[PDB]
């Protein structure tokens, strides 16, 4: 919706990092002697109402380099905003494309592709699949922003949040469907039982032959207290270019930024954990031609059921 894009745009810290990230990349690719000879082909993949487009303009001006912008966006409601902006403000430098990036047949290859396809668990928006599909129209020496992102998990104890999830039972579906789906939530009344560890990582452009975005991660969390496990808090880090990053991992949390809240992966039944014991969680990223979804299971100190098998309770639409 309009107001969903509005609140995204109301975080200046995020876009300043994007601005700085592109700024740096322009200076690296284009030298000083080729300032007004080379025009870099930028392509915002998922332009929305065009904050990244604006940022790309600012980045080019502070760098003092020439750029050619595309603004790919599948949502036709947002495209209306882009074209009204483009007509009034930007002009012919920005070429608004109303298409899916996976489909769009490009008339030109890009030097840089910029994207904002990340959620609270990084890859829960299917940024991998989208940017993989948009990889063909990147130059062989082309850059992606972000170039990398990683997801983190940490076990939590919250009799509040457990009881909150519990109350999300709805008519006409599985009685325990609510436990087999993630939630975006400002975690407050909870207890982080162990330090976050990396779960899934993705690099763009992906050069690995037969690029598979399915994953299987085992994590072991040393607990030093008695407690009751109710779920796993999820965070993410993303490398935009080099040293320019965004993060919602508590220990490396970008200061001021309030764009993403943490994500929660509940479990059906609480699990007792004695001091000294290790919480062992397993996380899968699964997919078919239609859907992408996560599965997870606790294996220590006791086994839980495998949650969300075949994405029965929760899927992410391709």
């Amino acid at each position: 919706e309009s107001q969903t894009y509005e609140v995204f745009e109301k975080d200046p810290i995020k876009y300043s990092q994007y601005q700085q990230a592109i700024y740096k990349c322009l200076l690296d690719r284009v030298p000083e002697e080729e300032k007004d000879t080379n025009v870099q082909v930028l392509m915002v993949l998922g332009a929305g109402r065009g904050p990244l487009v604006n940022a790309s303009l600012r980045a080019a001006k502070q760098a003092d380099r020439r750029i050619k912008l595309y603004a790919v966006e599948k949502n036709p409601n947002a495209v209306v905003t882009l074209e009204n902006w483009q007509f009034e403000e930007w002009g012919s430098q920005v070429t608004v494309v109303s298409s899916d990036m996976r489909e769009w047949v490009a008339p030109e290859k890009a030097d840089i592709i910029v994207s904002e396809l990340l959620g609270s668990f990084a890859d829960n928006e299917l940024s991998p699949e989208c940017l993989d599909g948009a990889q063909h129209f990147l130059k062989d020496d082309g850059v992606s922003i972000p170039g990398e992102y990683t997801s983190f998990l940490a076990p939590i104890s919250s009799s509040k949040l457990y009881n909150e999830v519990r109350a999300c039972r709805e008519k006409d579906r599985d009685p325990e469907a609510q436990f087999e789906m993630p939630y975006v939530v400002r975690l407050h009344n909870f207890h982080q039982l162990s330090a976050p560890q990396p779960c899934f990582t993705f690099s763009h452009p992906n050069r690995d032959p037969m690029i598979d975005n399915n994953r299987y991660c085992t994590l072991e969390f040393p607990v030093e207290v008695n407690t009751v496990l109710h779920g796993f808090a999820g965070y993410f880090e993303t490398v935009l270019y080099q040293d320019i990053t965004l993060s919602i991992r508590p220990e490396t949390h970008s200061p001021g930024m309030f764009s993403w809240f943490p994500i929660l992966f509940p479990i059906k039944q609480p699990i007792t954990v004695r001091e000294g014991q290790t919480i062992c969680v397993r996380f899968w990223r699964c997919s078919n031609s239609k859907k992408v979804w996560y599965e997870w299971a606790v294996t220590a100190p006791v086994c839980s059921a495998i949650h969300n098998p075949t994405g029965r309770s929760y899927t992410i639409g391709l």
Binding site: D212, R282, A305, I306, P309
Partner: protein
């Protein structure tokens, strides 16, 4: 009297094999759906683009034969819980393939091994298969009384066998099963095929399997002693176990080659029949109760209701 089958990991001709197995008096045949050694690639070229048929045709048997007489087996090379990422991914695709073919044939049961602690990814794949389609095929989990490591011969110089009494450690194969079936969330399609060893464990280890869904009881030929006549028999220890298993009404599978080469292969089965006939017969209680074993019924309320 007793329902029995034959486990083979080698079938050169599927029609001929059944004939032999059937003549000996077995009810069903446990066999591979793909050739055990026929390892298949799914990712890396050019091995993934291997031409020709992947296995036997379904036409070689009738639909009814597949449905009643055959029990599938996962190929041994399929290891979904491998440390190597390539072998994992391949084993996933291979496991799905074989399971899907099992459903295609319409097999009543399919064997999958529990021969280690971590069978998490194995469980995850099976659970996915169960939640795809509307097949009602059973899945028998091959799990031993005593783990292979714990029954190995003490013949390694710099690695002697554990001579210590580990009460929890001797119950490890149950914990293998328990974790698997918990991960799969107590699927009614998943049951146990308990493989009996040469040396039976302590009594507590056997009591562990009370109240578990034991459908099969695999009996190697190697565990059979030889009598004065020169025919296969079992120990008094094993006899008491078989007597217990007959109460549960499980299907005894015979596996391994004919060590008693002088006699026929029927002898093994004939001994189980011999045991079947030679049991304490059902009393008035167990005669009438035969039918309502673990059948849930609502308690009568003669006050509220009229009987």
């Amino acid at each position: 009297r007793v329902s029995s089958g034959r486990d083979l990991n080698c079938v050169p001709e599927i029609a001929d094999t059944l004939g032999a197995v059937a003549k000996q008096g077995f009810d069903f045949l446990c066999m591979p759906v793909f050739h055990p050694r026929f390892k298949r690639e799914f990712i890396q070229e050019p091995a993934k683009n291997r031409p020709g048929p992947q296995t036997r045709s379904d036409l070689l048997l009738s639909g009814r034969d597949w449905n009643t007489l055959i029990v599938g087996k996962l190929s041994p090379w399929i290891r979904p819980d491998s440390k190597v990422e390539k072998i994992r991914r391949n084993s996933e695709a291979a496991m799905l393939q074989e399971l899907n073919f099992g459903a295609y044939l319409g097999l009543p049961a399919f064997l999958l091994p529990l021969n280690q602690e971590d069978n998490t990814n194995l469980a995850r794949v099976l659970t996915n298969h169960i939640h795809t389609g509307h097949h009602s095929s059973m899945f028998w989990m091959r799990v031993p009384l005593v783990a292979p490591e714990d029954l190995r011969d003490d013949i390694i110089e710099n690695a002697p066998t554990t001579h210590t009494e580990e009460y929890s450690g001797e119950e490890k194969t149950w914990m293998w099963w328990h974790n698997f079936r918990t991960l799969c969330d107590y699927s009614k399609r998943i049951a146990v095929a308990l493989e009996i060893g040469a040396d039976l464990p302590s009594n507590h280890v056997i009591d562990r399997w009370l109240g578990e869904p034991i459908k099969a009881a695999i009996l190697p030929t190697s565990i059979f002693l030889t009598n004065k006549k020169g025919f296969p028999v079992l120990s008094k220890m094993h006899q008491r176990l078989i007597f217990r298993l007959l109460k549960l009404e499980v299907q005894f599978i015979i596996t391994g080659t004919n060590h008693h080469s002088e006699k026929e292969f029927c002898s093994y089965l004939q001994y189980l029949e011999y045991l079947s006939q030679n049991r304490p017969p059902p009393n008035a209680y167990e005669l009438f109760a035969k039918g309502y074993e673990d059948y849930l019924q609502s308690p009568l309320q003669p006050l509220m209701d009229n009987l």
